[PDB]
Symmetry: none
Subunit: 80 residues, 3 copies
Amino acid sequence: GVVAAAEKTKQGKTKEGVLYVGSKTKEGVVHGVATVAEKTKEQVTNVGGAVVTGVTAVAQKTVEGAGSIAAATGFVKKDQ
Amino acid sequence: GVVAAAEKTKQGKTKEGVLYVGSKTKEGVVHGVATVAEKTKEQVTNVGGAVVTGVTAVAQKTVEGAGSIAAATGFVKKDQ
Amino acid sequence: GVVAAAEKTKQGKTKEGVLYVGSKTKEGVVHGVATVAEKTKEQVTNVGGAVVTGVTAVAQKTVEGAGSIAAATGFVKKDQ
């Protein structure tokens, strides 16, 4: 088996704070997620989480919830 | 099996805070999610989460809920 | 078996703080996640977590929740 399980359980005066992000840039180039190829048979890309791309990227309190991904590629059963 | 499970369960005076993002840029180029290829057979892309792309990208409290993805490509059963 | 399990359980006046990020740059180039190849058969990419890419990337309190990934590629059962 190639199974995969994950669980989480909860049985439940603070200040949040400050997050300051200042960016001064010029002539920026960014590639978040890239798959380049030549003479390929399959190209699968599954995004279950969060992909934050930019010239100024900020992520806060992003991934705390339940999600599942199940991928299976190839599988050539060429008996004779 | 290629199964995949995930669960979450809950049995339930704070200040949120401050998030300041200032960006001064010029001539920016951004690619969030890209798949380039030549002479391919399949190109699948499933987005179950969040993809935030820009010159100034901010994500807050994004992915906390239930979702599932199930992909299967190829599968050539060429018996003779 | 190629199984994989993970669990978490909880049975439950502080100041958050300060996070200052200042960036002054010029002619930046960034590649977050890249897979280059030639004459390939499969190219799978599953994102269950968080990918933060940029010229100025900040991540705070990102990955605390339940998620699962299950991938299986190849699997050539070529008996004769």
